Amino acid sequence: YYTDSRDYDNLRSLSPLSSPEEHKQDAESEKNLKNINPDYRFWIKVEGTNIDFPVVQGKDNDFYLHHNFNKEKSFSGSIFVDSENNLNDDSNIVVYGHNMRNDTMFAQIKHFKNENFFNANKYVTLYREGKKSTFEIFSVYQENAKDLESEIKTKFSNKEDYEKYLKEQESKSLFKRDGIDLNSNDRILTLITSGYDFVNARIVVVAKEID
Numbered sequence: 001y002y003t004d005s006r007d008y009d010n011l012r013s014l015s016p017l018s019s020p021e022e023h024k025q026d027a028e029s030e031k032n033l034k035n036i037n038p039d040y041r042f043w044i045k046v047e048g049t050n051i052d053f054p055v056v057q058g059k060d061n062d063f064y065l066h067h068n069f070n071k072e073k074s075f076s077g078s079i080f081v082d083s084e085n086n087l088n089d090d091s092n093i094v095v096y097g098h099n100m101r102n103d104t105m106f107a108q109i110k111h112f113k114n115e116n117f118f119n120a121n122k123y124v125t126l127y128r129e130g131k132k133s134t135f136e137i138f139s140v141y142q143e144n145a146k147d148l149e150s151e152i153k154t155k156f157s158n159k160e161d162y163e164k165y166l167k168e169q170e171s172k173s174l175f176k177r178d179g180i181d182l183n184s185n186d187r188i189l190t191l192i193t194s195g196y197d198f199v200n201a202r203i204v205v206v207a208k209e210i211d
Contacts, residue, residue, distance in 0.1 A: 001102035004076045008069055011036075011054055016127040017045050027130055037069055041081055042128035044095065046191075048121035049108040053079045055095060057087075065098065076105055082154055087128070090154045091162055092188050099193040099203070106193035112140040112205050118175045124189060124207050135189040135207035138180045139173035145200040152190060152204075159184045169206045182208060 014033055016026035033040045039056040046052075058064045060083050068074035081087065082094040097106030111117045124135040156162040163184040170182055187209040195201035 001100065003100065003102060003104060004068055004074045005104055008053065008076065008078070011069060012052055014054075015045075015052065016043050016130075017052075017125060017132070023130070026127070030127075030130065037071065039064075041087060042126050044079060045125045046108070046121075047123045047125070048117070049111065050103070051106065051108055053097075053105075055079045055081055057081045057085065058083055061096065065096075076100060079105065085154050091156060091186075092152075092154050092165075092190055094152060094154055094190045094192065096192050099195065101196065106191065109191055109193045109203050109205055110195060112137065113142070113174060113203065115175055122177075124191070124205075126189070134210050136177070136180060136210045137205055137207040138177040138182055139169050139206040140204065141172040141174060142195050142197065142201050142203045143172075144198075145194075145202045148192070148202045148204065152192070172204075173206075180208065 014029050016029040033054055037056060039058060040054055041057050042055050044051065044053055044055050054069060056064055056069065056078050058080055064078040064080035066074065066077055068076065069078055077098050079095060079097040085093060087093065099105065099107045099110065101107065118140055122136050124137065126133045153165060156165065166182055166184065189207045191205040193203050195203040
């Protein structure tokens with residue numbers, strides 16, 4: 001299938017993930033992204049995949065299923081962070097994208113369901129507010145979309161509630177990541193897409209911030 005890929009890869013040359021003078025380069029990258037679309041928040045890259053995108057945040061979790069980075073009507077849409085996320089505060093950053101079965105957007109999240117892949121490809125890199133951060137994937141799973149929509153949280157009452165959430169997300173994983181010391185001080189990143197193994201499948205990857 002052929003789709004809206006070309007513009008959303010013009011942008012890839014604007015990636016802040018290509019010294020204080022390169023840093024300078026990456027800052028003008030972010031400023032140009034923000035200027036193209038003020039909804040821009042950060043850049044995501046996933047090791048070993050073609051996931052290498054700008055991430056936006058809309059006013060709801062539907063706009064950017066159907067619009068591109070320029071806000072034009074689009075089938076591929078955009079990669080977007082949950083509209084309810086507070087990126088300064090929240091312990092779980094939740095990010096969505098399409099899997100339209102033509103190897104674009106978040107299609108390649110499905111590769112993490114293969115144990116060899118999961119073992120070999122550990123890291124998700126973000127670039128936000130002039131800073132690179134790394135997250136190590138510890139959970140991969142799929143389930144029905146309605147259950148997922150009820151389970152995924154960005155906001156926690158207290159530490160105990162968060163620890164409980166972390167334990168749930170880790171317990172769900174097809175595969176165990178050894179030595180990841182998952183704990184309630186951690187900050188996590190959740191990546192969500194659709195799958196086609198069963199109707200209304202969602203595929204989920206959860207990763208914790210390291211370094």
